[PDB]
Amino acid sequence: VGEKGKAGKEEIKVKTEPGMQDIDAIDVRQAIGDAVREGLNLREGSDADMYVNELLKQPVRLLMQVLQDFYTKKYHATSLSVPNLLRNALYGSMLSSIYRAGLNYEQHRFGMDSLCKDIFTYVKQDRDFNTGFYLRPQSESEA
Amino acid sequence: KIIINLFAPNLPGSTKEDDLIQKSLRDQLVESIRNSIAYGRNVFFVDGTRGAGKTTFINSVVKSLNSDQDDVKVNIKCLPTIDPTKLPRHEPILVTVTARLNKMVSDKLKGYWASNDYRKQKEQWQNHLAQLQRGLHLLTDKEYKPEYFSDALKLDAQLDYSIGGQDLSEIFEELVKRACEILDCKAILITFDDIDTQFDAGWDVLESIRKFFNSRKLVVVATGDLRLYSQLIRGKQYENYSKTLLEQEKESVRLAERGYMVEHLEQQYLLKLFPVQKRIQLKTMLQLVGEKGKAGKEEIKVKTEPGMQDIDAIDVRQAIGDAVREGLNLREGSDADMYVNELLKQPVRLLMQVLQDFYTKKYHATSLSVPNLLRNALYGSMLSSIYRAGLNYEQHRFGMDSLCKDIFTYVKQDRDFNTGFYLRPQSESEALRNCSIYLASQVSENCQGSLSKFLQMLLVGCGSVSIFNQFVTELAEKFEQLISEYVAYMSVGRIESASHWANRCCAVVANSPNDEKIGVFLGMVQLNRKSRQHMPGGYKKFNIDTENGLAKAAMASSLSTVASNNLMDFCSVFNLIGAIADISACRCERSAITNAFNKVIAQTTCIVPPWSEATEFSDAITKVEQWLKNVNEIEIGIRPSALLIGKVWSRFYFNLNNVADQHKTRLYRNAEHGRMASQSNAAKIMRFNVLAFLHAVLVEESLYHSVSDREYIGEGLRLNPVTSVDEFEKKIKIIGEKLKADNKTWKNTHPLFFLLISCPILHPFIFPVGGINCSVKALNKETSFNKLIDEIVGDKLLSDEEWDYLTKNQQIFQNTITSLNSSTIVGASYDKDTP
Amino acid sequence: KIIINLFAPNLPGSTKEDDLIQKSLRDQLVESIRNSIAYGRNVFFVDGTRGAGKTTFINSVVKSLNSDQDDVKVNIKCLPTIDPTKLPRHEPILVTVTARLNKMVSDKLKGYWASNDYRKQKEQWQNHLAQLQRGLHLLTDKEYKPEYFSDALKLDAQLDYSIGGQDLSEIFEELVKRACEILDCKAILITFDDIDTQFDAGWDVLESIRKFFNSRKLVVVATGDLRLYSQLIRGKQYENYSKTLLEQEKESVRLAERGYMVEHLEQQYLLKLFPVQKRIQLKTMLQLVGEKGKAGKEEIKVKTEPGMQDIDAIDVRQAIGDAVREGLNLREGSDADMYVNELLKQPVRLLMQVLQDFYTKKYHATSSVPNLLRNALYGSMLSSIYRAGLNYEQHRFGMDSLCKDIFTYVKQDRDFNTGFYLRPQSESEA
Amino acid sequence: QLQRGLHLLTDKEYKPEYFSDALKLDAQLDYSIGGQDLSEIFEELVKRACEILDCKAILITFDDIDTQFDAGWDVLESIRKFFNSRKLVVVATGDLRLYSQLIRGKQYENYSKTLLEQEKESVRLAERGYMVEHLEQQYLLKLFPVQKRIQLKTMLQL
Ligand SMILES: Nc1ncnc2c1ncn2[C@@H]1O[C@H](COP(=O)(O)OP(=O)(O)OP(=O)(O)O)[C@@H](O)[C@H]1O
Structure with a gap:
């Protein structure tokens, strides 16, 4: 798909709602973009596309199941809390990375006792106490 | 409408409808299962930790699917x-599935009547089974026989399999297809139970699912914990590495890259088997019933009594609330509901066994000691956590001695030396979190119904860890040796008496030589045992014989000497409190009360800790005997918690820090007979040391004592009295009228403060002759202070002429201290005077 | 109220009435056992860290349940x-249970005289016995043989196995069900003893309870140190982890999460096997009689002299206090109660033997009191004397022997300040 | 009958074909439990031998295991299993530190080797040592009661 603009060999379009046609489909980069800027409460810019490019590098099996989970719960729930849907979608796909990093994984701990502790463990492994707490995808490890 | 009957067996097998905790997910999974067929491997994963109810969940799914299976479109x-x-x-999983599939098929053939169709579809089934048996060795073979090549090259069948060879999945795939034709079903559900009990045998479940269960006629529902399957999958990708490669490349650079590869093959092995869009997370009991403000997504009710009506059944959070609040002697609020939330986040089996054990014995006991019921209920459930964390486990040794040791050995692992004695479920580890609610039940059980055990837990239990957060922690395996020495020196867990703890507690605050060398400490003041020159004013070496009656008794209970290169002598408030903790334990007999004043005074030798470089007395006994009469009839309705004892120590410790340093300066020449707030002496420091304890008990009694639901201090800044009395006077004044407003007495709402403010041991320390802040207008506060105290206890502490001597600028004092002001404090320079 | 005569042949078995201390707890457990079968795994744990007479309590339950079958509803x-x-x-526990189930059932068959169900049920009984023999290889097989697959598909069973295949837990539960009908009873009781000597053999007990003894006509009473089952279960969950993973992921973060995972598997294994509401704690004598601060939940009296009557009896707290105060030459007070409380925390069979060794010998002397208590303790407390390293040779007693022991006691007690008081404030039970 | 049940002592695995042998109930046995209990068959041998030999008891005498103390485990296991009869008296010699050396070695063999390798922290390692030490005493005090032990005197004591 490439960067913004055409910038790519293949024009991949994706359908995010049942009953949709081949004409009103959305770009795969944009579909990741909408799920990221709405899910992470971000605006359009370099930071949003930094997550989008990181998500695009992910394996297609991991990438589709993020898209499949996000856009199948979204349609059913709304026939909102968009960050909740993305959190559940990223919980399953990145689960093996969450387990390795030592992050809290019990779904009943999802407050800030887990969260405020979670980013301290993450930054500790990132070995970057300066810019670690932005939670940027700037690490050198896939986990 | 979900009602759980605690007196029912409550087992996954013996759970009918109308009490399924997971009723929203049971319906959601079943419709999602049918949707998949009505529209490739089809695997649904029901996630959840151990004890979540995964067996109970699938058991309901099969029940809700086998009903009206032919009455629905799919x-x-x-x-x-x-x-x-x-x-x-x-036994291979494929063998188990086929064996259970054969029984279902054969039972259907016996239901047929047309022998032509019966025989037509039975020869096929027997042919497929016989072909599965022929190729079954492909799984259970440790080598490949050369004569099996003929089997792969045999085509003597009408099956005409797509791919060549003796593929076992292909044989099973048409075996399922034949079974669906016989059973007249569009799909077949293969439900797999969890592997949590023994997870090394769950690998065969995983491999079988991805190899033989790929058909469109098969629906696979497997439960368990993905945290547990990940360790099973990760440990099997490590077996794909040659042992020689692992041995020859043990250095970090290549070892870390292999670990990155294994976590990156594990990640997609789970994503291949259990797709994220099909996983279902089992909701813990907290997420169903919700919090007080958040809407409860479900409605769980509990039948806490046999024969209880469906309407009579109470909410589960209330059922846990009753057990937690009454069991821990804890009042409605944030602290009580913090324990309730933690019990809800527990695994369903653990939580449903705390309630089952508590309410079974609670009803049986009546046919009370509710904290005893919860202590036993939590002991069994959290036993695995108690064993792991090293707490006391024998039940014949439960007591105050075996509890204060547990509190110290818990905060040491919790590393929360500032608030660990609160015993809140805040520790990150689940083992320490589980022990927190069990320890809180231990504290609320032993200290309940007795004032003596309340003060022992206050000093020995809560205090010992604070006397470690300071004065011992600067010396820090060495830390575990420091713990070993400190608990052996102070003899926590085998204390002879509360007073004996205080004398040892005196040395540790003393064997830490403070700056400025002044012998004024946290809650204890050093006094000279020798006389020299250079002493101005009336200051003199302390003599016990000067005091009379309670005045002599009050110091005798407070004086504590430690044997060193020179015999230090101290007058602490811990010794005074420890003396109170000793008198309350004994009987109202006169003989036992006398020994309480004489357990330490002249028969102890407090050697310094190893971590160091080097008659009218009968009237006094009568007052204590009268007070002990009050204690034995008032302390029977006391409900102290681990939070209250932890809180009461916290304020009492903070005040002793303020009065320690705010009086390290005001030790000037004219400080004797101190009347302004800028002059202080041994009678000033000890007065506010004692008044600190009477305040910490007072302020957080109404705050946290379970006997009085309401709050009687009201709303305001809860400042504590240091070098003053208005802070204590403001609260004690405003509390009095509210009880008159509510038609309640001082003894049935604040039993702890009523007992300690009426204790004759500390009465001489409330109004010492040296320690009186009789200012131009502050004397009215103390005049009101005396009036309020005289009314609370019901007896006038000081007579009209007795009071006038303290305020107005001889007289003999049988109820107040006399010579404490004249005492010389070690390390004090009596050369600079008050400006 | 229990009243014990100390002049008797001292038979732990002949004790049936007015001499068994734990009757109050035994009746409650037996009633609980009967109530648990009215409505399913029924596993009862008789818990205790050390001593307390475990084997006699479960045997006393067997006697209480083997007798009085006519009066009881179940x-x-x-x-x-x-x-x-x-x-x-x-030998698997399933073989041991079945063999003792066969012995009970077969002996009942010889009790039959109506030779119609005598051979009808016996023929059915041997059908289940032989079928369990056929499927017994599933517990002892070191590998799976394809020839077994034909056996698992044999659907000629007359007892209608609901789930296909050779499931021993399904075969055994029908074997028990037939056994209950033959014996004219319900809910056969299986009792297990302690595994203290060799607790490696207790894992088969645990795996057999959860797998084969899950029937609703089966109630199990287990005994032993529950702290020792925890070490048994926890060590078996580490076996599930592959040896390659353990020796490759040796980091502290990876090792901690592996231990924490087993901390949770072990925790739920005990809760599933031994439910908290079903665990039974053997009450000690101090709890039964009370701390003398207030009235106790049970009153127990002792016949110090031969020929004492019902009213001519004293409380154990007084009988122990009489021995301690006279034996230790102690005055009545707080320090004398420090020894009676510890003597009341001892196992009952141990405690009443000290009383018998003291009071009865005190009679024969009448026909020094301190040596009578010393002799009474030495007879029954000798195990701790040897363990701590004190002097056990009775001919060598003296101040030279005594003062050496007292310095040896305070050396182990780690307290030289108040060690020479000999107050039972130590930690070790010895 | 004892020879029939001797395979239980020496078997590397349980053989299902002996299950039918454990169900061969007999009338002359009058055994309390019929699960082919070797400790019960041997008790009848001792009871019968006393009748034949006209003795009130039988003294089983064991020497010491100083030369090879591995062989002492079979002595301890046999004593506590088969030599519990009232008509049997057992006298065993040997260093009690050597016999305690045996049991402590065998009590550690009950622990799974994986548990010992993985849980090597001092907080858990010391807890195991407290338990194994507790297990060897209860094993020793139940095999050789303290009131029956006899200590040989040296020259100084003589
Ligand atoms: N719907 C329910 N109604 C009542 N009690 C329940 C329910 N679900 C769970 N429980 C309680 O929780 C316990 C755990 O049940 P279950 O056996 O399904 O859990 P699990 O640990 O996930 O399964 P497994 O036994 O297969 O390891 C039950 O024994 C019961 O006490």
Whole structure:
């Protein structure tokens, strides 16, 4: 798909709602973009596309199941809390990375006792106490 | 409407409808299962930790699917749930599935009547089974026989399999297809139970699912914990590495890259088997019933009594609330509901066994000691956590001595030396979190119904860890040796008496030589045992014989000497409190009360800790005997918690820090007979040391004592009295009228403060002759202070002429201290005077 | 109220009435056992860290349930107590349970005289016995043989196995169900003894309870140190982890999460096997009689002299206080109660033997009191004397022997300041 | 009958074909439990031998295991299993530190080797040592009661 603009060999379009046609489909980069800027409460810019490019590098099996989970719960729930849907979608796909990093994984701990502790463990492994707490995808490890 | 009957067996097998905790997910999974067929491997994963109710969940799913299977558009037949742990250790899963599939098919043939169709579809079934038996060795073979090549090259069948060879998945795939034709179903459900009991045998479940269960006629529902399957999958990708490569490349650079590869093959092995869009997370009991403000997504009710009506059944959070609040002697609020929330986040089996054990014995006890019921209920459930964390486990030794040791050995692992004695469920580890609610039940059980055990837990239990957060922690395996020495020196866990703890507690605050060398400490003041020159004013070496009656008794209970290169002598408030903790334990007999004043005064030798470089007395006994009469009838209605004892120590410790340093300066020449707030002496420091304890008890009694639901201090800044009395006077004044407003007495709402403010041991320390802040207008506060105290206890502490001597600028004092002001404090320079 | 005569042949078995201390707890457990079968895994744990007379309590339950079958609404036939540490190293517990179930059932068949169901049920009984023999290889097989697959598909069973295949837990539960009908009872009781001697053999007990003894006509009473089952279960969950993973992921973060995972598997294994509401704690004498601060939940009296009557009896707290105060030459007070409380925390069979060794010998002397208590303790407390390293040779007693022991006591007690008081404030039970 | 049940002592695995042998109930046995209990068959041998030999008891005498103390485990296991009869008296010699050396070695063999390798922290390692030490005493005090032990005197004591 490439960067913004055409910038790519293949024009991949994706359908995010049942009953949709081949004409009103959305770009795969944009579909990741909408799920990221709405899910992470971000605006359009370099930071949003930094997550989008990181998500695009992910394996297609991991990438589709993020898209499949996000856009199948979204349609059913709304026939909102968009960050909740993305959190559940990223919980399953990145689960093996969450387990390795030592992050809290019990779904009943999802407050800030887990969260405020979670980013301290993450930054500790990132070995970057300066810019670690932005939670940027700037690490050198896939986990 | 979900009602759980605690007196029912409550087992996964013996759980009918109308009490399924997971009723929203049971319906959601079943419709999602039918949707998949009505529209490739089809695997649904029901996630959840151990004890979440995964067996109870699938057991309901099969029940809700086998009912009206033919009465719905999509017919799905379900095999009996396969438990991977209970199967033979070497029996292949494909064998178990086929064996359970054969029974379902054969039972259907016996239901047919047309022998032509019966025989037509039975020869095929027997042919497929006989072909599965022929190729079954492909799984259970440790080598490949050369004569099996003929089997792969045989085409003597009408099957005409797509791919060549003796593919076992292909044989099973048409075997399922034949079974669906016979059973007249569009799909077949293969439910797999969890592997949590023995997870090494769950690998065969995983491999079988991805190899033989790829058909469109098969629906696979497997439960368990993905945290547990990940360790199983990760440990099997490590077996794909040659042992020689692992041995020859043990250095970090290549070892870390292999670990990155294994976590990156594990990640997609789970994503291949259990797709994220099909996983279902089992909701813990907290997420169903919700919090007080958040809407409860479900409605769980509990039948806490046999024969209880459906309407009579109470809410589960209330049922846990009753057990937690009454069991821990804790009042409605944030602290009580913090324990309730933690019990809800527990695994369902653990939580449903705390309630089952508590309410079974609670009803049986009546046919009370509710904290005893919860202590036993939590002991059994959290026993695995108690063993792991090293707490006391024998039940014949439960007591105050075996509890204060547990509190110290808990905060040491918790590393929360500032608030660990609160015993809140805040520790990150689940083992320490589980012990927190069990320890809180231990504290609320032993200290309940007795004032003596309340003060022992206050000093020995809560205090010992604070006397470690300071004065011992600067010396820090060495830390575990420091712990070993400190608990052996102070003899926590085997204390002879509360007073004996205080004398040892005196040395540790003393064997830490403070700056400025002044012998004024946290809650204890050093006094000279020798006389020299250079002493101005009336200051003199302390002499016990000067005091009379209670005045002599009050110091005798407070004086504590430690044997060193020179015999230090101290007058602490811990000794005074420890003396109170000793008198309350004994009986109202006069003989036992006398020994309480004489357990330490002249028969102890407090050697310094190893971590160091080097008659009218009968009237006094009568007052204590009268007070002990009050204690034995008032302390029977006391409900102290681990939070209250932890809180009461916290304020009492903070005040002793303020009065320690705010009086380290005001030790000037004219400080004797101190009347302004800028002059202080041994009678000033000890007065506010004692008044600190009477305040910490007072302020957080109404705040936290379970006997009075309401709050009687009201709303305001809860400042504590240091070098003053208005802070204590403001609260004690405003509390009095509220009880008159509510038609309640001082003794049935604040029993702790009523007992300690009426204790004759500390009465001489409330109004010492040296310690009186009789200012131009502040004397009115103390005049009111005396009036309020005289009314609370019901007896006038000081007579009209007795009071006037303290305020107005001889007289003999049988109820107040006399010579404490004249005492010389070690390390004090009596050369600079008050400006 | 229990009243014990100290002049008797001292038979732990002949004790049936007015002499068994734990009757109050035994009746409650037996009633709980009967109530648990009215409505399913029924596993009862008789807990205790050390001593307390475990084997006699479960045997007393067997006697209470083997007798009085006519009066009770539900009658329970009890297998003889199974000692897991006194069995062949490879014999499964399922074989041991069935063999003792066969012995009970076959002996009942000889009791039949109506020779119509005598051979009708016996023929059915041997059908289940032989079928369990056929499927017994599933517990001892070191590999799976394809020839077994034909056996698992044999659907000629007349007893209608609901779930297909050879499931021993399904075969055994029908074997028990037939056994209950033959014995004219319900809910056969299986009792297990302690595994203290060799707790490696207790894992087969645990795996057999959860797998084969899950029937609703089966109630299990287990005994032993529950702290020792925890070490048994926890060590078996580490076996699930592959040896390659353990020796490759050796980081502290990876090792901690592996231990924490097993901390949770072990925790739920005990809760599933031994439910908290079903665990039974053997009450000590101090709890039964009270601390003398207030009235106790039970009153127990002792016949110090031969010929004492019902009213001519004193409380154990007084009988112990009489021995301690006279034996230790102690005055009545707080320090004398420090010894009676510890003497009341001891196992009952140990405690009443000290009383018998003291009071009865005090009679024969009448026909020094301190040596009578010393002799009474030495007879029954000798195990701790040897363990701590004190002087056990009775001919060598003296101040030279005594003062050496007292310095040896304070050396182990780690307290030289107040060690020479000899107050039972130590930590070790010895 | 004892020879029939001797395979239980020496078997590397349980053989299902002996299950039918454990169900061969007999009338002359009058055994309390019929699960082919070797400790019960041997008790009848001792009871019968006393009748034949006209003795009130039988003294089983064991020497010491100083030369090879591995062989002492079979002595301890046999004593506590088969030599519990009232008509049997057992006298065993040997260093009690050597016999305690045996049991402590065998009590550690009950622990799974994986548990010992993985849980090597001092907080858990010391807890195991407290338990194994507790297990060897209860094993020793139940095999050789303290009131029956006899200590040989040296020259100084003589
Ligand atoms: N719907 C329910 N109604 C009542 N009690 C329940 C329910 N679900 C769970 N419980 C309680 O929780 C316990 C755990 O049940 P279950 O056996 O399903 O859990 P699990 O640990 O996930 O399964 P497994 O036994 O297969 O390891 C039950 O024994 C019961 O006490």
